[PDB]
Amino acid sequence: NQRIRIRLKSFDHRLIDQSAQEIVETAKRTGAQVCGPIPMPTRIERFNVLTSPHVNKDARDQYEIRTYKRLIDIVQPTDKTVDALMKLDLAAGVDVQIAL
Amino acid sequence: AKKGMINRELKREKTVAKYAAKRAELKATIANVNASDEERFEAMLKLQALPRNASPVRLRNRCGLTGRPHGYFRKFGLSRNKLRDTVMQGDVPGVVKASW
Amino acid sequence: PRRRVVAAREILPDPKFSSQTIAKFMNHVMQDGKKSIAESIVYGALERVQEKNKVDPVEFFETTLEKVRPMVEVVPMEVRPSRRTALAMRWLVDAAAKRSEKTMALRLAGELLDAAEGKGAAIKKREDVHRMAEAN
Amino acid sequence: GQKVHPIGIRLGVVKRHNANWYANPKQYAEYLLKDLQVREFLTKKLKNAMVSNILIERPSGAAKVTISTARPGIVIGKKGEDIEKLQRELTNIMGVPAQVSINEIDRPDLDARLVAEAIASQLEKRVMFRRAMKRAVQNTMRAGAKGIKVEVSGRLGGAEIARTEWYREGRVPLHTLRADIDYATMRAETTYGTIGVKVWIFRGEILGGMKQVMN
Amino acid sequence: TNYGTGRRKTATARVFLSAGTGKLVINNRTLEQYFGRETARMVVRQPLELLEATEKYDLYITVKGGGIGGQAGAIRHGITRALIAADETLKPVLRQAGFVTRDAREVERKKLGLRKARKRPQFSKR
Amino acid sequence: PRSLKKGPFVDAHLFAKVEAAVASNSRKPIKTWSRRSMILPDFVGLTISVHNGRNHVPVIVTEHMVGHKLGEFAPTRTYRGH
RNA sequence: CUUACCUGGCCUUGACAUACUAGAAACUUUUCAGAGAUGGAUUGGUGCCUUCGGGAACCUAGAUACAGGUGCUGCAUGGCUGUCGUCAGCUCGUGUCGUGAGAUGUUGGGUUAAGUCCCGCAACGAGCGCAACCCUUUUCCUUACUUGCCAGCAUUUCGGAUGGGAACUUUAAGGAUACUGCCAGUGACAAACUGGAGGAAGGCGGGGACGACGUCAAGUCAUCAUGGCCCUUACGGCCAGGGCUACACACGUGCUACAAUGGUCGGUACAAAGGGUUGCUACACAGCGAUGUGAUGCUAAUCUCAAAAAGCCGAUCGUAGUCCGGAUUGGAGUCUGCAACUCGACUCCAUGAAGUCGGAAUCGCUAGUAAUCGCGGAUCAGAAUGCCGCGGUGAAUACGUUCCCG
């Protein structure tokens, strides 16, 4: 009863789905059943920044940043699956957490 | 800001870091129920006898580039002017103009 | 506006009597979005008039409305039909507000019955409009 | 009135960010401050090497700095000593091992930063500003851009009253979000003060959106 | 048997329609227990009273989100969609009554420099 | 007010001075800048020169003053009318 | 503290840089005087490379080029911003007319949110502006099935709680759809305009971002950078206390009320978005309460802040300065913090001010808007009636351009 949990975090959804698709494709090639990827709710943070150097309270820029999360489950893992997962490259801008 | 103010901030940070451990020890001893009332009382006296700059409440957040004491935005560590300039140049990963 | 003609906003019929007149009266009574309180006030008065004379609530209300309806404003000119009803409801709520009784519903029913015999501040204001129209 | 930053307004539309890494909220500030220090240090050191773009990445507990330059030989060094020294200083500043990579620009006249740097150098060498502007605009248009606008502001020629002069050939559709517009700003420090230089270059409209751009 | 989904002001209602005596439960509650004000009860019942079919169907309803008015509107929309799915010939009558339209009105966001969506702070020439 | 579980607050340098005077019997006013110190029962009968931002004003401690801060008897702002 | 101001106490190549000369690991313990800055004694350690004759940081001593300045000039400047104003205009090349500066095109007739589009016309052609490309919301499809969901089956302590299911809601990536597409009438017969069907949506469906050529010697030398002028035992640097919180007055922007469409008490329903490891805390005990103690889960679609409030049902108050209002003051406390006197927030008991809907005048708003009700965040040890967001309930009126403003 060994299950592998993969969590992906990023600031760029196109990157995060590219990485998730690559991981899923590799796992399917190795010969293990996978579940996902499952999109978790996105986090959004906003800021209001005054633009003028001295006094204009109504002159502000509104910025935002988003955090995207993906969840992937691997069930019935073959022996080659794990070593393939550490052989898999790490792309900048996407953070990966693996739990056994 | 001025070099004197920046150096003052640096000195206060150094003092807080130096005295961090003993302050926590004395506070835990004061909170200790099993310890005697006398133990707690001399612990409180020693805490009051510690130097003033050892207290974290005297630290003020300043911009990491200019030293400005207003508009700090803990998440980036920069004041509003530098945050605007750098975000609009594109050196902050993930931050974009917000509309909804 | 200046260039366009804006259509009037159609209001839904009252879900209990299917009466746009009753719905408009409820909207005139309602304050700051409290529709439930206005519904209670209007329905209580409609039931009270039904008990104190066994008449249909809708018909009795239309007849009283036509009695308290003006015919002219003020320069004399003929008031369009919608403004007639809008002005009659305002008079009927304003004058009903000033009576002394336990609840707004009872005051509304009481002055509806009073106006059905032509006795009320709303009808007096109507006669005032008649006089000042004779003035012009 | 005032105009929005051409790169900032397109940072998520047709443009890529200059920093590509992820960090938790605790480490975000430290990472950003070290990145800014790295950028300032590199800008100071490579002043005469024709460097326009610096891209910083943090793939896995390490750093990768890509420098876009028109003087790859000068940047690299005689035998590669300069790149290894640069790696040492960058690792020292950043606290993690760092890899420097070089991307060579083959069309320098289509880079907004290099044109502004050249114009500012000429202004500091006190050539007449209208000649400098016309020469730069003609050179870029011959190079093959579809439009370029150049603006200079300040005490032009040493006059006691500052003013602003601009010059444009071609097409510059600033309100089109899908247009590819490079923008640059620079300072010329003359005996009579600061002169500001701004350059816009238009290189055609990008089609397919950010899906095509492959963020 | 038949299924419908209704939406109104961030409220979503799932409606399951069958043939039966006329039982109606909302979130394992009766209509009078769930809705306190009479108009909310009338809005829910409007489609069946219009069709004169108050007695031939059984309803199983769940609903989440929004307030009482939004939930009543969502339930009405879901019942209408369930009836349409059960019989396509009923669509003209319900469309004429106006029940098939999804009301897309929604709360407008607050805007920078304003107290509300449109309300502006008080201003003075003097 | 300060929480009762912590007790009253007195500056150590002022406490040492008053304790030394009471162990002795010196009537010399105690010069201090500690406007924040609490007046204790040992203070009664003593003269304390409290700083008020510009000067040192003398205060003679009586029984009724116990439980107050030293600064309440040294006003810091000057006002006589408009 | 911030702090740039005042009183008093101190330092002088300086709190910080480079360049030169010598000596030391750096660091570390314990005290004494002092309001502190500081000054004096007092311990341990004395380290890392080495072609090892010295070097790497780091500290101390001397010397002078210098540092330092939130000092002045926004009327010397860069950069950044407001405003007219989301106003609809601003230009260029060939050809014609004029001695010429110039004109024409860009005018004239309809129309539009728009120099938006169509006609005529010594004109024929182009760029920046408008519109579209970007984000969000409304209908449907595909992929994805956990921490989220529960239609059918089974077990249930009746709690999706448990097997289980991939239907539905939702979550979030990619797509489809709306284009005067169809019909009728009009306008010129064009641009268009009006009415009808279907459709979730019909003529720009709703909202956001995006602000042309230019004006105001508009604002900022106190974010920053920078020409010039000024100080150098002080206009620089360190410290304790005070002030920025004053108070016969005037003005601007707000909050709470003057009550019955209400106040109080008991019972009982329905959200969205956002935050949480120096943090948020289930539950139990103690307290009238703010809170305290023990303890549990959570690095979070998993645990938590968290009680939504207005709403509905029942009782009572009966028009009174009141069972309205909640200022002010007296007395007890809690928490953060080295420290709540000047000068914090909150809790309990007592007190119970003006206020009876407010002159001349003046402001905002055309639909999920106004009005009203609650909830969250940035800043932040603590300290919002401000600011930036989120949802609940949910109106009235537009005949028209005669006058007011632009």
Q: D11 CA to chain B: closest CA distance, Å?
A: 6
Distance CA F7, CA E81 (A): 72
- DSSP for B34-48 reads SS-HHHHHHHHHHHH
Measure, in angstroms, how far nucleotide G388 C1' is from residue D10 CA.
Answer: 25
Q: Which residue ranges make up each domain of chain A?
A: 2-100
Residue found under tokens 């289509």: D110
Token code pair at residue E6: 């209704």
Distance CA B54, CA F41 (A): 32
How far lies A33's CA from each of D134, D157, F53, in Å? 65, 74, 78
Burial pattern F22-53, b for ≥16 Cβ within 10 A else e, equals eeeeeeebbebbbbebbbeeebeebebbbbbe
Measure, in angstroms, how far nucleotide G110 C1' is from residue F64 CA.
Answer: 96
Is residue D32 within 8 A of residue A64, CB to CB? The reply is no
Distance CA E57, CA E76 (A): 15
User: Which residues of chain A have a CB within 8 Å of the CB of B96?
Assistant: 63-65
- Which chain G positions come under 7 Å from a protein C-beta? 1-4, 6-7, 15-16, 28, 34-37, 68-70, 76-85, 113, 127-140, 144-147, 150-151, 168-175, 198-201, 205-212, 214-215, 217, 219-220, 222-228, 236-244, 246-248, 251-254, 260-262, 269-278, 293-294, 300-301, 308-313, 318-319, 333-342, 344-345, 362-372, 378-381, 387-401
Across B2-100, the runs of DSSP E, i.e. the strands, are 96-97
Q: Do A65 and B95 touch (CB under 8 A)?
A: yes
Token code pair at residue B71: 């508009």
Burial class (CB in 10 A: 0-12, 13-18, 19+), D182: buried
Which of E39, E43, E46 lies nearest to residue C39, judging by beta carbons?
E39
Is residue E61 within 8 A of residue E15, CB to CB? The reply is yes
* Residue A60 contacts E, CB cutoff 8 Å: yes
Neighbours of chain C (3+ CB pairs under 8 A): E
User: Which residues of chain D have a CB within 8 Å of the CB of B65?
Assistant: 36
Q: Do E43 and C16 touch (CB under 8 A)?
A: no
Is residue C52 within 8 A of residue C118, CB to CB? The reply is no
CA atoms within 13 A on the CB side of C122: 30
Distance CA B96, CA D12 (A): 6
Q: Which residue ranges make up each domain of chain C?
A: 2-133
Q: What is the 3-state secondary structure (H, E, C) of chain C?
A: CCCCCCCCCCCCCCCCCCCHHHHHHHHHHCCCCCHHHHHHHHHHHHHHHHHHCCCCHHHHHHHHHHHHCCCECCCCCECCHHHHHHHHHHHHHHHHHCCCCCCHHHHHHHHHHHHHCCCCHHHHHHHHHHHHHHHC
CA–centroid distance for C3 within its chain: 33
User: Which residues of chain B have a CB within 8 Å of the CB of A12?
Assistant: 94
By C-alpha distance, which of D120, D144, D149 is closest to D132? Answer: D120
By C-alpha distance, which of D90, D95, D111, D76 is closest to D40? Answer: D90
Measure, in angstroms, how far nucleotide G285 C1' is from residue B14 CA.
Answer: 43
Distance CA E93, CA D191 (A): 85
By C-alpha distance, which of A69, E116, D4 is closest to B97? Answer: D4
Which of D9, D21, D22 lies nearest to residue B97, judging by beta carbons?
D9
Q: How was this structure determined?
A: cryo-EM
Q: What is the resolution of this structure in A?
A: 2.3
The SS3 call for residue D172 is coil
Q: Which residue ranges make up each domain of chain D?
A: 16-106, 107-210
Paired strand residues for A39: A70
Chains F and C touch (3+ CB pairs under 8 A): no
User: Which residues of chain E have a CB within 8 Å of the CB of A48?
Assistant: 112
Intra-chain end-to-end CA distance of chain E, in Å: 69
Q: D215 CA to chain A: closest CA distance, Å?
A: 6
